[PDB]
Design an enzyme around this catalytic site. Sequence first.
Site, mmCIF file in Angstrom:
data_model
loop_
_atom_site.group_PDB
_atom_site.id
_atom_site.type_symbol
_atom_site.label_atom_id
_atom_site.label_comp_id
_atom_site.label_asym_id
_atom_site.label_seq_id
_atom_site.Cartn_x
_atom_site.Cartn_y
_atom_site.Cartn_z
ATOM 1 N N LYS A 181 31.231 84.955 6.275
ATOM 2 C CA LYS A 181 29.831 85.009 5.880
ATOM 3 C C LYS A 181 29.058 83.788 6.371
ATOM 4 O O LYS A 181 29.651 82.755 6.681
ATOM 5 C CB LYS A 181 29.705 85.054 4.353
ATOM 6 N N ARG A 197 36.024 97.580 -1.317
ATOM 7 C CA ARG A 197 36.474 98.970 -1.257
ATOM 8 C C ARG A 197 37.974 99.043 -1.037
ATOM 9 O O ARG A 197 38.628 99.996 -1.476
ATOM 10 C CB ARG A 197 35.685 99.790 -0.226
HETATM 11 C C1 LIG Z 1 25.991 91.026 -1.246
HETATM 12 C C2 LIG Z 1 27.419 91.101 -1.702
HETATM 13 C C3 LIG Z 1 27.521 91.890 -2.987
HETATM 14 C C4 LIG Z 1 28.419 91.508 -0.614
HETATM 15 C C5 LIG Z 1 29.800 91.886 -1.131
HETATM 16 N N1 LIG Z 1 30.414 90.741 -1.818
HETATM 17 C C6 LIG Z 1 30.706 92.280 0.071
HETATM 18 O O1 LIG Z 1 32.059 92.351 -0.313
HETATM 19 O O2 LIG Z 1 30.704 91.189 1.002
HETATM 20 ZN ZN LIG Z 2 32.808 90.965 1.158
#
Ligand SMILES: CC(C)C[C@H](N)C(=O)O
Ligand SMILES: [Zn+2]
EC number: 3.4.11.1
Lengths: 484, 242, 484
Positions: A262, A336
């Site tokens: 990220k 997921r």
């Molecule tokens: C904006 C977030 C809720 C993104 C989320 N953590 C995804 O697994 O990276």
């Molecule tokens: Zn994530």
Amino acid sequence: TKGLVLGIYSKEKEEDEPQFTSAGENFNKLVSGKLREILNISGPPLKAGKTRTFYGLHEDFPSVVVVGLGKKTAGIDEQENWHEGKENIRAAVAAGCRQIQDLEIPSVEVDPCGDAQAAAEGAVLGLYEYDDLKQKRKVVVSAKLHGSEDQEAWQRGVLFASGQNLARRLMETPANEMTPTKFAEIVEENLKSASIKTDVFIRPKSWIEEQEMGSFLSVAKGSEEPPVFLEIHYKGSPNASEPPLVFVGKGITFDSGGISIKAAANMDLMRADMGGAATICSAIVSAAKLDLPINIVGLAPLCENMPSGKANKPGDVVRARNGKTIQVDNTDAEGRLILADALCYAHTFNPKVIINAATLTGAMDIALGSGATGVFTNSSWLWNKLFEASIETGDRVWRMPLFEHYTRQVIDCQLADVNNIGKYRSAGACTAAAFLKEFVTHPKWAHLDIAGVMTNKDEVPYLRKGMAGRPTRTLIEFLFRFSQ
Amino acid sequence: PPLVFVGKGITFDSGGISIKAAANMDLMRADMGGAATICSAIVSAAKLDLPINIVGLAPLCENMPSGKANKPGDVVRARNGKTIQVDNTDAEGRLILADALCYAHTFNPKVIINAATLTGAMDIALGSGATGVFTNSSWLWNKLFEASIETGDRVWRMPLFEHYTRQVIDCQLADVNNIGKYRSAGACTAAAFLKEFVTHPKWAHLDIAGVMTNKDEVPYLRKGMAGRPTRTLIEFLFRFSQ
Amino acid sequence: TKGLVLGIYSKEKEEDEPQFTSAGENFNKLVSGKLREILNISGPPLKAGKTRTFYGLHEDFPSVVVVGLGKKTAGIDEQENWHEGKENIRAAVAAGCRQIQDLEIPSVEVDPCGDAQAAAEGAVLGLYEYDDLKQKRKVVVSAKLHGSEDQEAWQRGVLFASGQNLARRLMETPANEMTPTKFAEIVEENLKSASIKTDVFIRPKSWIEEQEMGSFLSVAKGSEEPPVFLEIHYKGSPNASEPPLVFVGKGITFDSGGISIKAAANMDLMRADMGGAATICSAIVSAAKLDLPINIVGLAPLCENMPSGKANKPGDVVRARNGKTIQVDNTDAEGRLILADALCYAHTFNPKVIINAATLTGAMDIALGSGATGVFTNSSWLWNKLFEASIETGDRVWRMPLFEHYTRQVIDCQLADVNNIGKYRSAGACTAAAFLKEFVTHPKWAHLDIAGVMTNKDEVPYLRKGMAGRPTRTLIEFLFRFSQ
Ligand SMILES: CC(C)C[C@H](N)C(=O)O
Ligand SMILES: [Zn+2]
Ligand SMILES: CC(C)C[C@H](N)C(=O)O
Ligand SMILES: CC(C)C[C@H](N)C(=O)O
Ligand SMILES: [Zn+2]
Ligand SMILES: [Zn+2]
Ligand SMILES: [Zn+2]
Ligand SMILES: [Zn+2]
Ligand SMILES: [Zn+2]
Ligand SMILES: [Zn+2]
Ligand SMILES: [Zn+2]
């Protein structure tokens, strides 16, 4: 010494002056009309959510804060899908309580404002603040009901709000403190204090490996922090064999994104990527405090998503508990992956309904923001129960589509049965939900994407800036109505 | 009284001074899809000789960068007198629609329906699965929904909450800002912005940005501009006339 | 009806209670000790910048707001380079006035707080808000001095603050309204109302072309909005032949960046890229209202920087009035281009000093933010005069280096005499200043880069969110001291 928060409604057309609540009119009488006289002298009338402080009116209450309640007969708002009256009360009481806190008064008595549960929710949600790690803190305020009539409604409100506040604390806490093990231990102690009819299992890595949860394991391995699979049981039904309602929550204690790393900006907010686990677990603690006569099971896979020499690599193929293969095209679509295994496991309890919650996609925030939680479900009956509950709590839900159109974009996969990111960037929350459906065969399943209601700046008047703990109260209300 | 339809007709959207990125900008030649769909729907209703009065309104222009283009921060006055701070020149559809929607009230219509390829956020929200519908009338939502079940060109309801209005009326220089305070819920805040120019009890806003094109989602449409949701609009008018 | 703002100091160690100002103690006496009694009942003492409102104490003042002034003997703070006492007063009075405004009271009387000029500055700067284009507006509050002693100090404060407020209005106004012509016309009317000893020339494009200002013209041509060169004269000296002090200001009414186009995010703030012109012009208007006995000339090239079929193209070479050639490598470094011509022209008045101001570089904001205005000067005498003035006003200045080291990076040029952006990205504000020096041969020249003090969020307590108008008061103070 002691503060007092009193409510006043907006003046109706054929009235000569705005009307106080029952407690307000009585207080005015106790001080021989002094409250009405000073309010009249002070200026404009008080509108919804506004406050004004009056000093020295009574020796027991040196500071009296009057709050605007809006229109007295505000009921269900068809445009907003909520009970407006309750929302006005929660916001007005929170504002009053904070003024008392700024004055550094340790205790406040609160006007029930025609709905003690909502007044209690405003005071308890309104005063909350996570400041365990700071030297400079605001005064601790003890809020209690003014009067002795309808104490059960007041207490119901404290219960609901305390449930949401626990979810907020769990979410706000820095990840180096709120690790998978620590989260599990805190939840365990809260559930056990709530009821003796509970069993908690903080399942270790070896158990996870025995359960063939290769998808969940692929995510956890990148980090040095040990993963745990939290399983909680609340045996509230008179009949022990009664099938349970199962709740599942995404528990990523920290999401860096992994190899698909990220950007730095605001990445600290990812310490709340365990919000799904925090909300469903707090909901079960509250249901347990309420001794609801229903059996409930809570499941929460917990781990960190970090980059390292052993982390998930883009393109890797992992096997879920049910044998389906998944191509991990983007390591930041990790929720997921862990949920695939938790949802498969949920079927082993032969549940009545399956509800999972997750701070899953940035797309959900882009879709609805903090206005409502997105709900994807294969059961309109279930959608309706969650929707009705939300109207009462004010912590809104909005239905999102579970169409095969989206499933097609995740099963079109180069190397495996299903891809962890869609072919296109459109409808991110819908394709993520479609991915989860491949691991569900139950007739009553609902997926709640709470990424957009993770935080609060100022959207919800009664919540200070920070992690929101939404939609805990809607979950509690749903369980309450279900038990009746 | 007529049923009034309004459509965003930006023949080409470059973004203006708040210029768009080059990648796939050619698709912006379809930023007049709102106008194309409501107008085609009226042509069909007319071929069908439906026994109802209908008015179609479509402001049409290009959004280009130049020595006389809209500049970020500029304040403009809508037909109804409300002022708008143009913080981002690429949020131009809501600007042209503000005036068209004000004008729509002059026909004292039975219902007001506007369509627009309005936000990238709508595509991120639902993609090409369904058209997003924002409305202050559940009766109207239901009629559009029922029609879509028959045509297969689906609609899905999106929220019109004051929560979103707050993010557009919180404005430094004017009555309303053309982009919200935050980047969250782009399609909802755009819809909230439009509501400030509507006082009618039966208004529906259709954001068709996500159903602008087809690659292979709809089997019976070749690759290219989709023309959605024209048939749902025609079906709605048909059922309304009966 | 009428509101009242009173100040109270922080309690000193050997005092029994915090002391009111003279007006505060007197008011308390008028109400037979009622003010002290209610303040005692209300709770904790008032700290610097904090306020508390008391109702019904006197029939003429139904709302009385007491404000915390901090320590009574706060003088010059060696750490902060300002008079702390004055800063406490400005902030406390602004806070008090806003509480009166929120109560919707049209008029307020203000405690001089031991320094009427500072109290006036707090009230006038504090209540300001640009809301000409909104239907929803706050009540207009008329603030006046409480008492009749030291009226000249109060009025001096209103004058200084009104000067800064004009700069704020000019900066805040949307660019489609605040065009080069409109800015010139507004300034002209303000100067002319201030004194009959003035001459204003709104020089048109043909004049600009006659003056061989090819650098300024290259910037303007990209836009359809006509450019103007504003020239203002204030003949305040008894001797008309007395050499003038010359002020120069960058007047880009809107900066899109041109062909080297800016990113969309927050580009609306570029409507204030004429802040240099706004501040030096407002300073001259105030000096004129004060009838300072000195001759002053103000120069402001004004235009828009837009992309089009005739705009400046990267690599183009333009000729300044003085004959030097400039390679326009980046069209968004347009301020130094228009200033090159204005500074050359400034020498024709054979000035005593030359001071230019400009919202010039993003690098200056990265360097000092809104803490202080960056000052580049070849005269330590001049630096000292500006520095001393800033200590009094609180609108701080901080010296930045004018070294040949930076000049080297702009004269190393492929096609021309000087390049409009340096070889490297380091020290952006210093190389921009070096570029300007190539157009100055005067022994007392100061360049003020005000890009970092363009706006206010909450850094300066007494200024609401928006364009700040800094450092107008420091400029006025400098001129005042210079005339004596
Ligand atoms: C904006 C977030 C809720 C993104 C989320 N953590 C995804 O697994 O990276
Ligand atoms: Zn994530
Ligand atoms: C994705 C697009 C529908 C964006 C839309 N044309 C906006 O005015 O720029
Ligand atoms: C940050 C800004 C002050 C930049 C400056 N307007 C330059 O000419 O682009
Ligand atoms: Zn946490
Ligand atoms: Zn995540
Ligand atoms: Zn656009
Ligand atoms: Zn567009
Ligand atoms: Zn301006
Ligand atoms: Zn520039
Ligand atoms: Zn500039």
